């Protein structure tokens, strides 16, 4: 569950690397890697905060490109682009907006894990020599070891 | 630990 | 039945509910939900506001909130007698999804898991682009600072009197309209709502060359609007001939032809119902109305008035608020060309402001104005 049962104020979590947004009283979950960036604007007493998500045309400069999260999962799927809201009635939008920027480190970790999925072709299963003796040496050093 | 060369590696002395 | 005064419904405050055998009565304007109109129950603890989430066939979703965790054994106890319906969204949080246009909602189904269902009652405007980008702009009915809470403005997805061409500095070109008790600023940047009670003061000043006028509206910091001297066009109000006399307290007629900046200032004075501050009659060097000076590595115009000095960030130094003033000058051959400085210190906010680059004639005019105003000049 969330930090509180009521969600009048926007609360953001960092352990799960994800956020929950009430879309006019309806909560929906979003990922930090699914969100691109955010910005704020102030005009007089009005405050408008926009959060742009990661999608085709926003995460990538050229549309219909190759993206590991959006396009490699489904290259022809509907995606959300951005959302906008107003937090002018309360001086607590900065504390919630700091957690979205703190989630960018987890988004970069998710991107590093996605780039760690490359070179999928690996070694096959190895059967040990059970046919009697095995040939060995002593006093052997190995250079690319992590020792 | 790295062994860049078998013959010897850098002394790591500061540049005057 | 049960009665509770802490039931929250609809960007607003809480309301009241009444259970009955014939239906449900929700009072904020009483509303009746019949038992034959409910279709499904989506009450679950996976989302915030753990209460019943009922679906109705009357183009609305009963998203009632403000119920305890022990009410699920109680309210469903009222459901097994007649409805006999057991209450069982999306938790993946991935960007992948599918948009489906329902009869009155927009289903966001992320591989069989619906996430969003927005009714069309709260929708205000929709826009589309050539790249199949859909943007829905809404207007949440904010009533007070406490009861509004967080509110949404725009959602994007990928698949009386009004004015036009108005240049503002607090910077760009947009449009402004006057509502019955509010003002809406619309443009390519953003949409803003301004209250008449939030507006405090309105002033109009000229430039040094008298080619443009600056209208400063201080609302509690100050919005500055620059207008040309050739703006002489007539405006009209879309209102009744008898209702406008009561609305504006007969201050101005429905049709009037004058300067547009003067008409806007008169409309602001009529709406605010406060006295305006006219520019002073004091003349600077070469018949100027203001003095140019450097502050925060920016050139700005400082002009005195009857009770305050306005420097155009835009600052206002009151005569009563400023505790003391002082003048500093050095001895050199270049002392006659913008070398003297004037520093004013105020103990109300504990702040000192120093304006440098003042010539001999400008300092003499400032000293004459201070001697006329009998201000405390420290030496």
Swiss-Prot record, chain A:
Coiled-coil zones: 93-123
Subcellular location: Nucleus; Chromosome
Functional summary from the UniProt entry: Component of the FACT complex, a general chromatin factor that acts to reorganize nucleosomes. The FACT complex is involved in multiple processes that require DNA as a template such as mRNA elongation, DNA replication and DNA repair. During transcription elongation the FACT complex acts as a histone chaperone that both destabilizes and restores nucleosomal structure.
Family per similarity comment: Belongs to the peptidase M24 family. SPT16 subfamily.
Subunit-level organization: Forms a stable heterodimer with POB3. The SPT16-POB3 dimer weakly associates with multiple molecules of NHP6 (NHP6A or NHP6B) to form the FACT (yFACT or SNP) complex. The FACT complex interacts with the CK2 (casein kinase II) complex subunits CKA1, CKA2, CKB1 and CKB2 and the components of the transcription machinery CHD1, CTR9, PAF1 and CDC73. The FACT complex interacts with the PAF1 complex. Interacts with POL1. Interacts with SAS3. Interacts with YTA7.
Note: Present with 18500 molecules/cell in log phase SD medium.
Official protein name in the record: FACT complex subunit SPT16
Gene name of the encoded protein: SPT16
UniProtKB/Swiss-Prot annotation, chain C:
Gene Ontology terms: biological process: chromatin organization; DNA repair; DNA-templated DNA replication; nucleosome organization; positive regulation of RNA polymerase II transcription preinitiation complex assembly; regulation of chromatin organization
Biological function: Component of the FACT complex, a general chromatin factor that acts to reorganize nucleosomes. The FACT complex is involved in multiple processes that require DNA as a template such as mRNA elongation, DNA replication and DNA repair. During transcription elongation the FACT complex acts as a histone chaperone that both destabilizes and restores nucleosomal structure.
High-level lineage: Eukaryota, Fungi, Dikarya, Ascomycota, Saccharomycotina
Matches recorded under Pfam families: PH1_SSRP1-like (PF21103), POB3_N (PF17292), Rttp106-like_middle (PF08512), SSrecog (PF03531)
GO molecular function, a single term: DNA binding
Miscellaneous comment in the UniProt entry for this protein: In contrast to the orthologous protein in animals and plants, this protein does not contain a HMG box DNA-binding domain. This function may instead be provided by the HMG box of the associated NHP6A/NHP6B proteins in the FACT complex of yeast. Present with 22400 molecules/cell in log phase SD medium.
Subunit text: Forms a stable heterodimer with SPT16. The SPT16-POB3 dimer weakly associates with multiple molecules of NHP6 (NHP6A or NHP6B) to form the FACT (yFACT or SNP) complex. The FACT complex interacts with the CK2 (casein kinase II) complex subunits CKA1, CKA2, CKB1 and CKB2 and the components of the transcription machinery CHD1, CTR9, PAF1 and CDC73. The FACT complex interacts with the PAF1 complex. SPT16 interacts with SAS3 and POL1. Interacts directly with RFA1.
Keyword entries, A-Z: Chromosome, DNA damage, DNA repair, DNA replication, Nucleus, Transcription, Transcription regulation
Family designation: Belongs to the SSRP1 family.
UniProt-recorded name of the protein: FACT complex subunit POB3
One cellular component (GO) term of this entry: chromatin
Source organism per UniProt: Saccharomyces cerevisiae (strain ATCC 204508 / S288c) (Baker's yeast)
Localization per Swiss-Prot or TrEMBL: Nucleus; Chromosome
């Amino acid at each position: 569950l969330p930090t509180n049962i009521r969600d009048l104020r926007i609360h953001v979590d960092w352990k799960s690397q994800t956020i929950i947004l009430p879309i006019y009283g309806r909560p929906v979950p979003f990922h930090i890697n699914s969100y691109k960036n955010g910005s704020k604007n102030e005009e007089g007493e009005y405050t408008y905060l926009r959060l742009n998500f990661n999608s085709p045309g926003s995460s990538g400069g050229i549309s219909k490109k190759v993206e590991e999260l959006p396009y490699e999962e489904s290259a022809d799927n509907q995606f959300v682009r951005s959302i906008t809201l107003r937090s002018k009635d309360g001086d607590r939008m900065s504390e919630t907006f700091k957690q979205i920027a703190d989630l960018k480190k987890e988004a970069t970790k998710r991107e590093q894990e996605r780039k760690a999925l490359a070179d999928v072709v690996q070694q096959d299963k190895l059967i040990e020599n059970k046919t009697g003796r095995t040939k060995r040496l002593d006093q052997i050093f190995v250079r690319p070891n992590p020792d | 630990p790295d062994m860049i060369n078998p013959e010897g590696d850098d002394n790591e002395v500061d540049d005057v | 039945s049960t009665d509770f005064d802490r039931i929250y419904l609809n960007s607003k405050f809480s309301g009241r509910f009444r259970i009955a055998d014939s239906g449900l009565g929700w009072k904020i304007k009483p509303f009746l939900l019949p038992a034959t109109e409910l279709s499904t129950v989506q009450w679950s603890r996976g989302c915030r506001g753990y209460d019943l989430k009922i679906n109705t066939k009357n183009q609305g979703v009963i998203q009632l909130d403000g119920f305890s965790q022990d009410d699920y054994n109680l309210i469903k106890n009222d459901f097994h007698r007649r409805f006999n319906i057991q209450v069982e969204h999306s938790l993946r949080g991935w960007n992948w999804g599918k948009t489906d246009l329902a009869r009155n909602e927009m289903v966001f189904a992320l591989n069989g898991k619906p996430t969003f269902e927005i009714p069309y009652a709260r929708i205000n405007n929709t826009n589309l682009t050539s790249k199949n980008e859909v943007g829905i702009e809404f207007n949440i009915q904010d009533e007070e600072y406490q009861p509004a809470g967080d509110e949404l403005v725009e959602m994007r997805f990928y698949i009386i009197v009004s004015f036009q061409d108005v240049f503002f500095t607090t910077r760009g070109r947009y449009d402004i309209d006057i509502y019955k008790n509010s003002i809406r600023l619309r443009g390519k940047t953003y949409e803003y709502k301004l209250q008449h009670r939030q507006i405090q003061r309105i002033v109009s000043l000229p430039k040094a060359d008298d080619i443009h006028h600056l209208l400063v509206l201080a609302i509690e910091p100050f919005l500055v609007l620059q207008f040309q001297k050739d703006e002489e066009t007539e405006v009209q109000l879309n209102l009744e001939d008898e209702d406008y006399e009561e609305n504006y307290k007969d201050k101005l007629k429905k049709q009037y032809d004058a300067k547009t900046h003067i008409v806007l200032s008169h409309v602001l004075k009529g709406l605010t119902d406060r006295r305006v501050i006219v520019p002073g009659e004091y003349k600077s060097k070469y018949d100027q109305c203001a003095v140019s000076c450097s502050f925060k590595a920016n050139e700005g115009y400082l002009y005195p008035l009857d009770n305050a000095f306005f420097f155009l960030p835009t600052l206002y130094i009151p005569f009563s608020d400023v505790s003391m003033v002082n003048i500093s000058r050095a001895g050199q051959t270049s002392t006659s060309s913008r070398t003297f400085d004037l520093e004013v210190v105020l103990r109300s906010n504990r702040g000192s402001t120093t304006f440098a680059n003042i010539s001999k004639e400008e300092q003499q005019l400032l000293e004459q104005f201070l001697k006329s105003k009998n201000l405390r000049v420290k030496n």
